[PDB]
Protein backbone atom coordinates (compact mmCIF):
# COMPACT_ATOMS: atom_id res chain seq x y z
CA UNK A 1 0.00 0.00 0.00
CA UNK A 2 3.07 2.25 -0.07
CA UNK A 3 2.43 3.20 -3.71
CA UNK A 4 -1.32 3.85 -3.91
CA UNK A 5 -1.31 6.87 -1.59
CA UNK A 6 -2.52 10.17 -3.01
CA UNK A 7 -0.51 13.36 -3.56
CA UNK A 8 -1.52 16.72 -2.12
CA UNK A 9 -3.16 18.38 -5.11
CA UNK A 10 -6.14 15.98 -5.17
CA UNK A 11 -7.18 16.89 -1.64
CA UNK A 12 -10.15 19.03 -0.63
CA UNK A 13 -8.73 22.33 0.56
CA UNK A 14 -10.50 22.05 3.92
CA UNK A 15 -8.40 18.99 4.71
CA UNK A 16 -5.09 20.60 3.78
CA UNK A 17 -5.39 23.14 6.59
CA UNK A 18 -6.28 20.43 9.12
CA UNK A 19 -2.88 18.79 8.75
CA UNK A 20 -1.09 22.07 8.02
CA UNK A 21 -1.62 23.33 11.57
CA UNK A 22 -0.54 20.00 13.07
CA UNK A 23 2.66 20.37 11.07
CA UNK A 24 3.02 24.09 11.80
CA UNK A 25 2.56 23.56 15.53
CA UNK A 26 5.24 20.93 16.13
CA UNK A 27 7.79 22.44 13.74
CA UNK A 28 7.63 26.21 14.22
CA UNK A 29 5.80 27.04 17.44
CA UNK A 30 7.36 24.43 19.71
CA UNK A 31 10.86 24.94 18.31
CA UNK A 32 11.03 28.53 19.58
CA UNK A 33 13.04 29.15 22.75
CA UNK A 34 11.60 31.87 24.97
CA UNK A 35 13.08 32.71 28.38
CA UNK A 36 10.61 35.09 30.04
CA UNK A 37 11.11 33.46 33.47
CA UNK A 38 14.15 35.62 34.26
CA UNK A 39 12.22 38.87 34.59
CA UNK A 40 8.91 37.51 35.82
CA UNK A 41 10.37 36.34 39.12
CA UNK A 42 12.28 39.49 40.08
CA UNK A 43 9.74 42.28 39.57
CA UNK A 44 7.30 40.06 41.43
CA UNK A 45 9.94 40.10 44.21
CA UNK A 46 11.16 43.72 44.02
CA UNK A 47 7.56 44.86 44.48
CA UNK A 48 7.92 45.90 48.08
CA UNK A 49 8.26 49.46 46.74
CA UNK A 50 5.55 51.27 48.69
CA UNK A 51 5.28 54.46 50.75
CA UNK A 52 6.25 44.04 57.49
CA UNK A 53 3.64 43.25 54.84
CA UNK A 54 4.42 40.49 52.32
CA UNK A 55 5.70 41.28 48.85
CA UNK A 56 3.65 39.60 46.06
CA UNK A 57 5.94 36.56 45.75
CA UNK A 58 5.41 35.82 49.43
CA UNK A 59 1.66 35.93 48.85
CA UNK A 60 1.98 33.46 45.99
CA UNK A 61 4.03 31.03 48.07
CA UNK A 62 1.67 31.34 51.04
CA UNK A 63 -1.29 30.62 48.79
CA UNK A 64 0.06 27.30 47.54
CA UNK A 65 0.87 26.17 51.07
CA UNK A 66 -2.67 26.82 52.27
CA UNK A 67 -3.94 24.73 49.38
CA UNK A 68 -1.60 21.95 50.49
CA UNK A 69 -2.85 21.98 54.09
CA UNK A 70 -6.59 21.37 53.67
CA UNK A 71 -7.12 17.78 54.80
CA UNK A 72 -8.78 16.51 51.64
CA UNK A 73 -8.97 12.88 50.52
CA UNK A 74 -6.26 13.01 47.86
CA UNK A 75 -4.15 15.65 46.16
CA UNK A 76 -5.96 16.69 43.00
CA UNK A 77 -4.31 18.03 39.86
CA UNK A 78 -3.76 21.80 39.89
CA UNK A 79 -2.42 22.90 36.52
CA UNK A 80 -1.89 26.42 37.85
CA UNK A 81 0.61 24.91 40.28
CA UNK A 82 2.31 23.20 37.32
CA UNK A 83 3.03 26.48 35.55
CA UNK A 84 4.63 28.07 38.60
CA UNK A 85 6.80 25.29 40.02
CA UNK A 86 9.11 25.22 37.02
CA UNK A 87 8.86 29.00 36.55
CA UNK A 88 10.42 29.29 39.97
CA UNK A 89 12.90 26.50 39.25
CA UNK B 1 -70.30 27.24 30.67
CA UNK B 2 -69.19 30.80 31.34
CA UNK B 3 -70.97 34.10 31.85
CA UNK B 4 -69.90 37.56 30.74
CA UNK B 5 -70.53 40.81 32.62
CA UNK B 6 -69.39 43.57 30.28
CA UNK B 7 -67.67 46.83 31.22
CA UNK B 8 -67.54 49.10 28.17
CA UNK B 9 -68.41 47.95 24.63
CA UNK B 10 -66.97 49.40 21.47
CA UNK B 11 -68.26 49.07 17.92
CA UNK B 12 -70.64 46.14 18.43
CA UNK B 13 -70.83 45.48 14.68
CA UNK B 14 -67.99 42.95 14.52
CA UNK B 15 -67.55 39.55 16.15
CA UNK B 16 -64.78 36.93 15.83
CA UNK B 17 -65.25 34.60 12.85
CA UNK B 18 -63.13 31.74 11.55
CA UNK B 19 -59.71 32.48 10.09
CA UNK B 20 -58.90 35.67 11.98
CA UNK B 21 -56.33 37.15 14.30
CA UNK B 22 -57.45 37.87 17.85
CA UNK B 23 -55.18 40.32 19.68
CA UNK B 24 -56.12 40.70 23.35
CA UNK B 25 -54.46 42.77 26.07
CA UNK B 26 -55.88 40.72 28.93
CA UNK B 27 -54.97 40.26 32.58
CA UNK B 28 -55.82 37.45 34.98
CA UNK B 29 -57.18 37.00 38.48
CA UNK B 30 -57.77 34.16 40.89
CA UNK B 31 -61.13 34.20 42.67
CA UNK B 32 -59.85 35.95 45.81
CA UNK B 33 -58.57 38.87 43.75
CA UNK B 34 -55.00 37.52 43.89
CA UNK B 35 -53.82 37.94 40.32
CA UNK B 36 -51.17 35.88 38.57
CA UNK B 37 -50.95 37.06 34.95
CA UNK B 38 -51.08 40.39 33.15
CA UNK B 39 -50.01 40.92 29.56
CA UNK B 40 -50.30 44.69 30.03
CA UNK B 41 -47.13 45.05 32.10
CA UNK B 42 -44.73 43.42 29.64
CA UNK B 43 -46.24 45.64 26.90
CA UNK B 44 -46.88 42.80 24.49
CA UNK B 45 -50.51 42.10 23.58
CA UNK B 46 -51.49 38.45 23.50
CA UNK B 47 -52.17 37.38 19.91
CA UNK B 48 -53.91 34.01 19.75
CA UNK B 49 -55.61 32.49 16.72
CA UNK B 50 -59.30 31.65 16.49
CA UNK B 51 -60.52 28.05 16.56
CA UNK B 52 -57.05 26.47 16.52
CA UNK B 53 -57.53 25.07 20.07
CA UNK B 54 -54.30 26.54 21.42
CA UNK B 55 -55.85 28.71 24.13
CA UNK B 56 -57.94 27.27 26.95
CA UNK B 57 -61.54 27.02 25.78
CA UNK B 58 -63.03 29.21 28.51
CA UNK B 59 -61.02 32.05 27.05
CA UNK B 60 -61.98 30.87 23.56
CA UNK B 61 -65.77 30.63 23.53
CA UNK B 62 -66.00 33.50 25.98
CA UNK B 63 -64.23 35.60 23.36
CA UNK B 64 -67.04 34.84 20.89
CA UNK B 65 -69.44 37.23 22.64
CA UNK B 66 -66.86 40.02 22.45
CA UNK B 67 -66.95 42.86 19.96
CA UNK B 68 -64.24 45.21 18.74
CA UNK B 69 -63.08 47.52 21.51
CA UNK B 70 -65.30 45.72 24.02
CA UNK B 71 -64.01 45.42 27.57
CA UNK B 72 -65.68 42.73 29.66
CA UNK B 73 -65.06 41.12 33.03
CA UNK B 74 -65.88 37.51 32.20
CA UNK B 75 -65.44 34.43 34.38
CA UNK B 76 -64.82 30.72 33.93
CA UNK B 77 -66.00 27.52 35.55
CA UNK B 78 -63.48 24.96 36.85
CA UNK B 79 -64.68 22.46 34.23
CA UNK B 80 -63.60 24.70 31.33
CA UNK B 81 -60.08 25.56 32.56
CA UNK B 82 -57.73 23.14 34.41
CA UNK B 83 -60.36 21.07 36.17
CA UNK B 84 -58.76 18.63 38.59
CA UNK B 85 -55.04 19.00 37.86
CA UNK B 86 -54.58 22.76 37.65
CA UNK B 87 -51.55 24.41 36.17
CA UNK B 88 -48.78 22.65 38.14
CA UNK B 89 -47.06 25.05 40.52
CA UNK B 90 -49.14 28.09 39.60
CA UNK B 91 -52.85 27.57 40.26
CA UNK B 92 -54.52 24.89 42.41
CA UNK B 93 -57.20 22.58 41.00
CA UNK B 94 -60.96 23.23 41.21
CA UNK B 95 -60.52 27.01 40.98
CA UNK B 96 -62.41 29.55 38.89
CA UNK B 97 -60.74 32.03 36.53
CA UNK B 98 -61.98 35.60 36.75
CA UNK B 99 -60.50 37.53 33.84
CA UNK B 100 -60.39 41.08 32.50
CA UNK B 101 -60.06 41.23 28.72
CA UNK B 102 -60.37 43.76 25.93
CA UNK B 103 -59.83 43.31 22.20
CA UNK B 104 -57.54 45.65 20.31
CA UNK B 105 -58.46 45.28 16.63
CA UNK B 106 -58.72 42.90 13.65
CA UNK B 107 -61.54 40.85 15.26
Amino acid sequence: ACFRMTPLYNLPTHRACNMFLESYKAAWILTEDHSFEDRMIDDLSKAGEQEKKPDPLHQLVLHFSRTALTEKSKLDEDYLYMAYADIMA
Amino acid sequence: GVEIETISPGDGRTFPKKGQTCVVHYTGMLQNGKKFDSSRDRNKPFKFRIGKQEVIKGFEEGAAQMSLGQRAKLTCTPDVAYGATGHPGVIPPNATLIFDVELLNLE
Binding site: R66, T70 | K34, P88, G89, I91, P92
Partner: protein, 273 residues
Protein backbone atom coordinates in the same frame (compact mmCIF):
# COMPACT_ATOMS: atom_id res chain seq x y z
CA UNK C 1 9.56 -0.53 70.47
CA UNK C 2 9.61 -1.81 66.91
CA UNK C 3 12.36 -4.36 67.62
CA UNK C 4 10.94 -6.70 70.28
CA UNK C 5 9.29 -9.53 68.27
CA UNK C 6 8.22 -11.55 71.28
CA UNK C 7 5.43 -13.75 72.69
CA UNK C 8 3.31 -14.24 75.80
CA UNK C 9 2.18 -17.34 77.68
CA UNK C 10 0.01 -18.15 80.68
CA UNK C 11 3.01 -18.59 82.95
CA UNK C 12 0.93 -20.15 85.74
CA UNK C 13 0.02 -22.89 83.24
CA UNK C 14 2.78 -22.65 80.64
CA UNK C 15 0.13 -22.50 77.91
CA UNK C 16 0.83 -20.66 74.65
CA UNK C 17 -2.16 -18.65 73.47
CA UNK C 18 -2.47 -19.09 69.71
CA UNK C 19 -4.94 -19.09 66.86
CA UNK C 20 -6.61 -21.90 64.90
CA UNK C 21 -9.78 -13.34 59.67
CA UNK C 22 -11.58 -14.72 62.72
CA UNK C 23 -8.65 -16.78 63.98
CA UNK C 24 -9.77 -17.62 67.53
CA UNK C 25 -6.71 -17.36 69.77
CA UNK C 26 -6.62 -20.23 72.28
CA UNK C 27 -4.15 -21.53 74.85
CA UNK C 28 -2.29 -24.35 73.08
CA UNK C 29 0.36 -26.35 74.91
CA UNK C 30 2.26 -27.22 71.73
CA UNK C 31 4.05 -23.98 70.92
CA UNK C 32 4.27 -23.04 67.26
CA UNK C 33 6.05 -20.89 64.67
CA UNK C 34 3.38 -18.16 64.54
CA UNK C 35 3.32 -16.50 67.97
CA UNK C 36 6.14 -14.02 67.27
CA UNK C 37 4.95 -10.41 67.16
CA UNK C 38 6.50 -6.99 67.71
CA UNK C 39 4.44 -4.38 69.52
CA UNK C 40 4.07 -0.70 68.67
CA UNK C 41 2.97 2.55 70.28
CA UNK C 42 -0.44 4.20 70.60
CA UNK C 43 -1.01 7.97 70.66
CA UNK C 44 -1.88 10.35 73.48
CA UNK C 45 -5.23 11.56 72.14
CA UNK C 46 -7.05 8.28 71.52
CA UNK C 47 -5.67 6.82 74.74
CA UNK C 48 -7.56 9.64 76.44
CA UNK C 49 -10.58 9.11 74.19
CA UNK C 50 -10.78 5.39 74.94
CA UNK C 51 -11.35 5.37 78.70
CA UNK C 52 -14.23 7.86 78.70
CA UNK C 53 -16.18 5.52 76.41
CA UNK C 54 -15.94 2.75 79.01
CA UNK C 55 -17.15 5.24 81.61
CA UNK C 56 -20.17 6.25 79.53
CA UNK C 57 -21.37 2.83 78.38
CA UNK C 58 -21.48 1.64 81.97
CA UNK C 59 -23.20 4.91 82.82
CA UNK C 60 -25.71 5.01 79.98
CA UNK C 61 -26.84 1.38 80.20
CA UNK C 62 -27.27 1.87 83.94
CA UNK C 63 -29.48 4.82 83.04
CA UNK C 64 -31.24 2.85 80.30
CA UNK C 65 -32.51 -0.20 82.20
CA UNK C 66 -33.34 1.89 85.25
CA UNK C 67 -35.89 3.72 83.13
CA UNK C 68 -37.40 0.54 81.67
CA UNK C 69 -38.00 -0.94 85.14
CA UNK C 70 -41.23 1.11 85.38
CA UNK C 71 -41.99 1.29 81.66
CA UNK C 72 -45.60 0.19 82.04
CA UNK C 73 -46.32 0.12 85.76
CA UNK C 74 -47.19 3.49 87.33
CA UNK C 75 -46.38 4.38 90.91
CA UNK C 76 -48.73 5.72 93.59
CA UNK C 77 -34.50 2.29 92.74
CA UNK C 78 -33.47 5.82 91.74
CA UNK C 79 -32.26 7.42 88.54
CA UNK C 80 -28.78 8.94 87.97
CA UNK C 81 -30.29 12.26 86.90
CA UNK C 82 -27.68 14.63 88.33
CA UNK C 83 -25.01 12.33 86.88
CA UNK C 84 -26.31 12.50 83.31
CA UNK C 85 -26.73 16.26 83.51
CA UNK C 86 -23.01 16.93 83.80
CA UNK C 87 -21.74 13.95 81.83
CA UNK C 88 -23.68 15.28 78.85
CA UNK C 89 -22.35 18.83 79.23
CA UNK C 90 -18.72 17.86 78.71
CA UNK C 91 -19.57 15.74 75.67
CA UNK C 92 -20.81 18.94 74.03
CA UNK C 93 -17.56 20.67 74.91
CA UNK C 94 -15.44 17.71 73.86
CA UNK C 95 -17.08 17.87 70.42
CA UNK C 96 -17.04 21.64 70.10
CA UNK C 97 -16.38 22.95 66.58
CA UNK C 98 -13.49 25.39 66.12
CA UNK C 99 -14.14 29.10 65.80
CA UNK C 100 -13.86 31.17 62.64
CA UNK C 101 -11.51 33.71 64.25
CA UNK C 102 -8.70 31.14 64.47
CA UNK C 103 -5.57 31.01 62.35
CA UNK C 104 -6.00 28.80 59.29
CA UNK C 105 -2.89 26.57 59.19
CA UNK C 106 -3.47 25.48 62.80
CA UNK C 107 -7.26 25.19 62.66
CA UNK C 108 -7.15 22.01 60.59
CA UNK C 109 -5.05 20.32 63.26
CA UNK C 110 -7.85 21.16 65.66
CA UNK C 111 -10.31 19.99 63.01
CA UNK C 112 -8.57 16.73 62.11
CA UNK C 113 -8.36 15.92 65.81
CA UNK C 114 -12.13 16.28 66.03
CA UNK C 115 -12.96 14.13 63.00
CA UNK C 116 -10.72 11.29 64.17
CA UNK C 117 -12.42 11.37 67.56
CA UNK C 118 -16.03 11.54 66.43
CA UNK C 119 -15.73 8.54 64.12
CA UNK C 120 -13.95 6.77 66.98
CA UNK C 121 -17.25 7.01 68.84
CA UNK C 122 -19.51 5.92 65.98
CA UNK C 123 -17.77 2.59 65.49
CA UNK C 124 -17.72 1.58 69.17
CA UNK C 125 -21.49 1.79 69.27
CA UNK C 126 -22.53 5.11 70.87
CA UNK C 127 -25.13 5.88 68.18
CA UNK C 128 -27.64 3.16 68.95
CA UNK C 129 -27.58 3.83 72.67
CA UNK C 130 -27.98 7.58 72.25
CA UNK C 131 -30.95 6.75 70.03
CA UNK C 132 -32.13 4.00 72.37
CA UNK C 133 -32.16 6.45 75.27
CA UNK C 134 -34.35 9.05 73.55
CA UNK C 135 -37.17 6.94 72.07
CA UNK C 136 -37.94 5.37 75.44
CA UNK C 137 -37.86 8.93 76.75
CA UNK C 138 -40.13 10.45 74.12
CA UNK C 139 -42.86 7.90 74.83
CA UNK C 140 -44.05 10.49 77.34
CA UNK C 141 -45.90 13.35 75.67
CA UNK C 142 -46.70 15.98 78.29
CA UNK C 143 -44.14 17.39 80.71
CA UNK C 144 -45.24 16.03 84.08
CA UNK C 145 -48.51 14.27 83.20
CA UNK C 146 -46.55 11.33 81.79
CA UNK C 147 -43.69 11.93 84.20
CA UNK C 148 -46.11 10.87 86.94
CA UNK C 149 -44.77 7.34 86.41
CA UNK C 150 -41.64 8.35 88.34
CA UNK C 151 -42.45 11.37 90.48
CA UNK C 152 -42.73 15.14 90.50
CA UNK C 153 -39.21 15.67 91.85
CA UNK C 154 -37.62 13.72 88.98
CA UNK C 155 -40.05 15.31 86.52
CA UNK C 156 -38.45 18.74 86.12
CA UNK C 157 -35.28 17.46 84.44
CA UNK C 158 -37.21 15.62 81.72
CA UNK C 159 -37.71 18.87 79.81
CA UNK C 160 -34.05 19.89 79.78
CA UNK C 161 -32.19 16.65 79.13
CA UNK C 162 -34.05 16.01 75.88
CA UNK C 163 -32.69 19.43 74.90
CA UNK C 164 -29.23 18.03 75.57
CA UNK C 165 -29.74 14.68 73.87
CA UNK C 166 -30.58 16.23 70.54
CA UNK C 167 -27.64 18.60 71.02
CA UNK C 168 -24.94 15.94 71.16
CA UNK C 169 -26.42 14.25 68.11
CA UNK C 170 -25.64 17.41 66.17
CA UNK C 171 -22.21 17.44 67.81
CA UNK C 172 -20.90 14.13 66.47
CA UNK C 173 -22.83 14.23 63.18
CA UNK C 174 -21.77 17.67 61.94
CA UNK C 175 -19.50 17.48 58.90
CA UNK C 176 -18.89 13.73 59.16
CA UNK C 177 -20.03 12.40 55.79
CA UNK C 178 -19.41 8.82 56.92
CA UNK C 179 -21.64 9.21 59.96
CA UNK C 180 -24.28 11.15 58.03
CA UNK C 181 -24.71 8.16 55.72
CA UNK C 182 -26.04 6.21 58.73
CA UNK C 183 -29.37 8.04 58.45
CA UNK C 184 -30.31 6.72 55.01
CA UNK C 185 -32.16 3.84 56.65
CA UNK C 186 -34.29 5.79 59.12
CA UNK C 187 -35.30 9.18 57.74
CA UNK C 188 -38.81 8.52 59.07
CA UNK C 189 -37.31 8.55 62.56
CA UNK C 190 -36.66 12.29 62.66
CA UNK C 191 -39.72 13.44 60.71
CA UNK C 192 -41.90 11.43 63.06
CA UNK C 193 -40.76 13.77 65.83
CA UNK C 194 -40.12 17.20 64.33
CA UNK C 195 -43.31 18.68 65.80
CA UNK C 196 -42.94 17.18 69.27
CA UNK C 197 -43.30 20.70 70.77
CA UNK C 198 -40.45 20.22 73.28
CA UNK C 199 -36.91 21.16 72.19
CA UNK C 200 -38.55 21.73 68.81
CA UNK C 201 -35.66 23.73 67.37
CA UNK C 202 -33.27 21.02 68.56
CA UNK C 203 -34.41 18.29 66.18
CA UNK C 204 -34.66 20.87 63.39
CA UNK C 205 -30.95 21.59 63.65
CA UNK C 206 -30.24 17.85 63.74
CA UNK C 207 -31.95 17.49 60.39
CA UNK C 208 -30.22 20.52 58.89
CA UNK C 209 -26.65 19.25 59.13
CA UNK C 210 -27.50 15.73 57.95
CA UNK C 211 -29.15 17.25 54.86
CA UNK C 212 -25.97 19.08 53.87
CA UNK C 213 -23.26 16.50 54.52
CA UNK C 214 -24.60 13.32 52.90
CA UNK C 215 -26.13 13.51 49.40
CA UNK C 216 -27.13 9.84 49.69
CA UNK C 217 -30.18 10.71 51.82
CA UNK C 218 -31.63 13.20 49.36
CA UNK C 219 -32.99 10.82 46.72
CA UNK C 220 -34.86 8.61 49.22
CA UNK C 221 -37.60 11.06 50.19
CA UNK C 222 -41.14 11.34 48.85
CA UNK C 223 -43.91 13.92 49.18
CA UNK C 224 -45.09 12.44 52.49
CA UNK C 225 -41.93 13.87 54.04
CA UNK C 226 -42.25 17.27 52.39
CA UNK C 227 -45.83 17.93 53.48
CA UNK C 228 -44.66 17.08 56.99
CA UNK C 229 -41.89 19.66 56.50
CA UNK C 230 -44.03 22.53 55.22
CA UNK C 231 -46.61 21.91 57.94
CA UNK C 232 -43.83 22.72 60.42
CA UNK C 233 -43.42 26.09 58.69
CA UNK C 234 -47.12 26.84 59.22
CA UNK C 235 -47.22 25.84 62.89
CA UNK C 236 -44.10 27.71 64.01
CA UNK C 237 -44.31 31.16 62.45
CA UNK C 238 -42.00 32.70 59.87
CA UNK C 239 -38.84 30.85 60.83
CA UNK C 240 -35.84 31.80 58.72
CA UNK C 241 -34.22 28.44 59.44
CA UNK C 242 -36.77 26.40 57.50
CA UNK C 243 -36.06 28.19 54.28
CA UNK C 244 -32.47 26.97 54.43
CA UNK C 245 -33.42 23.33 54.92
CA UNK C 246 -35.73 23.64 51.92
CA UNK C 247 -32.85 25.05 49.87
CA UNK C 248 -30.33 22.42 50.94
CA UNK C 249 -32.79 19.67 50.06
CA UNK C 250 -32.87 20.89 46.46
CA UNK C 251 -29.28 20.74 45.19
CA UNK C 252 -25.95 19.47 46.50
CA UNK C 253 -22.36 19.59 45.21
CA UNK C 254 -23.34 20.98 41.82
CA UNK C 255 -25.90 18.19 41.34
CA UNK C 256 -29.59 19.01 40.95
CA UNK C 257 -32.41 16.68 41.95
CA UNK C 258 -35.35 17.28 39.62
CA UNK C 259 -37.36 14.52 41.30
CA UNK C 260 -38.14 16.99 44.08
CA UNK C 261 -37.35 20.31 42.47
CA UNK C 262 -41.02 20.21 41.51
CA UNK C 263 -42.27 18.75 44.80
CA UNK C 264 -41.56 21.93 46.75
CA UNK C 265 -43.54 23.94 44.25
CA UNK C 266 -46.79 21.97 44.14
CA UNK C 267 -47.32 22.56 47.87
CA UNK C 268 -46.01 26.11 48.35
CA UNK C 269 -46.70 28.44 45.44
CA UNK C 270 -50.38 27.82 44.47
CA UNK C 271 -51.48 28.14 48.10
CA UNK C 272 -50.43 31.83 48.31
CA UNK C 273 -51.34 31.93 52.03
Amino acid sequence: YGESLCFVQHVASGLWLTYALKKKAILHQEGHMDDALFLTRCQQEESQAARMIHSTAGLYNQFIKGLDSFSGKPRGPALPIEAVILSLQDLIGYFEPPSEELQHEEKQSKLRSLRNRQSLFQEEGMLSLVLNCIDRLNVYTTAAHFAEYAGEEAAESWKEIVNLLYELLASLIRGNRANCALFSTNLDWVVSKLDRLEASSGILEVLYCVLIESPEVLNIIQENHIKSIISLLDKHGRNHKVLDVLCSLCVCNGVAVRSNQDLITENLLPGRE
